Design a protein around this ligand. Sequence first.
Ligand SMILES: [K+]
Ligand SMILES: [K+]
Ligand SMILES: [K+]
Ligand SMILES: [K+]
Ligand SMILES: [Mg+2]
Ligand SMILES: [Mg+2]
Ligand SMILES: [Mg+2]
Ligand SMILES: [Mg+2]
Ligand SMILES: [Mg+2]
Ligand SMILES: [Mg+2]
Ligand SMILES: [Mg+2]
Ligand SMILES: [Mg+2]
Ligand SMILES: [Mg+2]
Lengths: 114, 55, 123, 130, 55, 123
Amino acid sequence: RGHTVYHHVEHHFQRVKVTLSPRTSGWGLRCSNLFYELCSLAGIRDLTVDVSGATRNKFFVAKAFFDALQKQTAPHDGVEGTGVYVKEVVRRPVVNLGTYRNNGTLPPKEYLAT
Amino acid sequence: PGXXXXXXXXXXXXXXXXXXXXXXXXXXXXXXXXXXXXXXXXXXXXXXXXXXXXX
Amino acid sequence: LTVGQLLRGGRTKKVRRSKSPALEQCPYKKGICLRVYTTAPKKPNSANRKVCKVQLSNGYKVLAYIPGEGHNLQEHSIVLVRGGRTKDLPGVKYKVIRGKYDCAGVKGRKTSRSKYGVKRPKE
Amino acid sequence: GGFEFVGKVVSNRMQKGVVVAVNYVVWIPKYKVYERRTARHMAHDEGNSCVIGDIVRIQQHRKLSKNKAYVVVSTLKHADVYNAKQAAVLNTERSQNKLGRVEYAESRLSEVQQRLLKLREMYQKELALN
Amino acid sequence: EVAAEQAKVAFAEQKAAAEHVRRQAALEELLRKTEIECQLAMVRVGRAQKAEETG
Amino acid sequence: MNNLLTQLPKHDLLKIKLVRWGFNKKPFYVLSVMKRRQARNSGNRYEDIGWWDPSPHQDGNSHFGIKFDRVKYWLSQGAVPTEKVYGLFGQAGIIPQKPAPPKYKPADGNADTKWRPELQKNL
RNA sequence: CAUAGGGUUUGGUUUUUGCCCAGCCUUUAGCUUAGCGUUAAGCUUAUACAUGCUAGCCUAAAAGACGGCGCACAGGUGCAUAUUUUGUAAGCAUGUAAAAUA
RNA sequence: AAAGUGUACUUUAUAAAGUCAUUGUAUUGCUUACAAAUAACUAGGCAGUUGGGUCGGCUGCUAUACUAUAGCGCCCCAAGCCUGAUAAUUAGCUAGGCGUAACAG
RNA sequence: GAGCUCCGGCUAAUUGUGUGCCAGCAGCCGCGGGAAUACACAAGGGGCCAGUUUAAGGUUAAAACAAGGCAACGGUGUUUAAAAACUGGAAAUGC
Ligand SMILES: [K+]
Ligand SMILES: [K+]
Ligand SMILES: [K+]
Ligand SMILES: [K+]
Ligand SMILES: [Mg+2]
Ligand SMILES: [Mg+2]
Ligand SMILES: [Mg+2]
Ligand SMILES: [Mg+2]
Ligand SMILES: [Mg+2]
Ligand SMILES: [Mg+2]
Ligand SMILES: [Mg+2]
Ligand SMILES: [Mg+2]
Ligand SMILES: [Mg+2]
């Protein structure tokens, strides 16, 4: 939809590790200052980025971020060979149990059914 | 016998008990320690303690 | 580590020391001055820095640096000591708070008066 | 908890008494594993004829002594006991006669065939019950 | 009390069903293993006849 | 945490009591079943049965909530309401009003100012 | 309700390890400070203590407790305690037993 | 039992009641299991110590269960019981609470 | 409007005068030897605000169960080995 990534991405450029996690539209950007500037250029609006390892050389960090974006897969890749209708659906994402307990809230009723 | 056992198996109430297993299990006790010696001096005793048909 | 190693106390929490052990986890400590003198810094610096030897109320003896320009500290003077290390002076890890019981503020100070114990001039 | 246990007999040196070993696990929240542990319990044996190595079932009971608060209810497996007289008879049979290569192999084949045939009949009966 | 009695009857029925499933499974495995043993026995008989000629 | 008690007292009485849960000059009460001899706001209870707001609102009324079914249960078991709880139950029509004895003492002339030194300072 | 880094090691680069800083929460010290209403609170000593107060009420075998009911409730502290405790679960025989209703 | 009973006590041309004393189907309960900080430069610990038998273990006043917590105590009998035991250091425990995406602290 | 603190870089915010490795500053890298945006003072400006800036504690800035190394330095001289954990295997004899 021009604002986030299709799924979770993990890439290993030489001595650098980058992780990308999709977020709901309007959530915002959670990343370092360097990646914040890069996201503005590309148009990414909602994402969480975590980078670790030997990050002294910023050329490698930018290169790793560039390569990670190119490892995504789309629902329309070779769809003609599936014989089905790949339909977009609305499903709210969940958080871990610890987050619910600390905030004093409940998950969707579909899981609490008892 | 295992970790929690202190005697050998198949011991009836009438049969006697020994300390052969306790030495093997709790081998760290100083009461069961010996002095350094040669291989033959240490192996010969163990060999005879298992075969009762050798003088 | 394996599961067995972790169960048998494999991991031990790292322990970090304090930078002012003589304070016994207290923000400040009172003491009495034993000797007042000057010392020279290490390379590449050069100066005659004012220091004093103070015996704390807990019985420990430490070296304290006197900030500012000039002081009226003598032997047998009650002072209050806080943390803080002077990098160029080896072995000095404490500083004297000015304006308190016996130490007075620097005369003529106009800026950062609070850090040197000088009251605001009413005139 | 602790109403009933199944364990192994590790001591029969007391009068109408026995010690039984038990295995259990404990959850360690920090490492997400189950830790295997052991315990020892003393039980009352009315028969006073238990053998070290037996598997028995013990049940909670009224306190009888300082360290005895259980009673032996049943035995699930009896420990093997060496018997010299029986072993000697078996040795005599083994030494009584010997067979050649072909005779022994043929006898082995016949015995397996008979065992297989009986097993097939039992399996068919089980299917019929189903 | 009425609900408790029905639960006890339900438990007995479920246990009987489970035992039958296990018994059939055990018999199936045993039958397969015995067949493998029989095949090896037939092979051994041929080798025994061959070995006797060498002697 | 605050598991409710199940065993009944053997040497004391059960009562239905008011628990102060207000603010400075803003009282608010909760009704609960508690042992007769305890602290006022003790955490030992058998059940919480209602609440009361004694001050008037814009509508000129006071507001009171209660469990009708559970009040009857505890009254049957032997719980004895206090004097104020009898008044609330009597007006709410749960049980008949309890008569009060005659009064002869001259009533207090300073009831809302005797215990408030702030007003007396202005007086 | 969902994971952010920067500075530093002086031929250059890459790599490994250490050090420092930015947040939130909590107490003191310097300088400085008009008022009213209100929430949550008194974080070092089981160190030594002048003085006032915190549990009494009622009745009467001759105007008086000797008797009845309370002090088995509240309030204070964390010396000692690794289990004596704390947090949980489980166990503990019977149609409650007698009597011609002939 | 938010009860009954009284050769009892107090008040009344107005009286209903309370006070004191006494009474309950066995007349106020014991036991076991699991979890919870460091610690081997603490390796042996225990002799009433582990188990068995007689006796004792009181405060009465339904009937049986062949005596119906217990080395809890005396006497006698058999040698067993524990072994990361025993000995040390530190701390009241649970939990609200504070940091953390969480796990953890 | 009112105070406290800061203006070389990390980090938002500069000019003048005095001093001359002296007096002093400093969380880190570091400033001062006669031309100092880093010391002292004046002016100008930044931050927070009836508060503000040190010092001292808990936790975070993944100590690695989710998730670190023995390839910068660390695997111990070798073998045998009835606890524990994990888990079937190709052995013995004769000229
Ligand atoms: K100065
Ligand atoms: K204190
Ligand atoms: K009485
Ligand atoms: K070596
Ligand atoms: Mg990171
Ligand atoms: Mg040698
Ligand atoms: Mg300054
Ligand atoms: Mg935070
Ligand atoms: Mg009375
Ligand atoms: Mg203590
Ligand atoms: Mg700037
Ligand atoms: Mg600066
Ligand atoms: Mg300056």
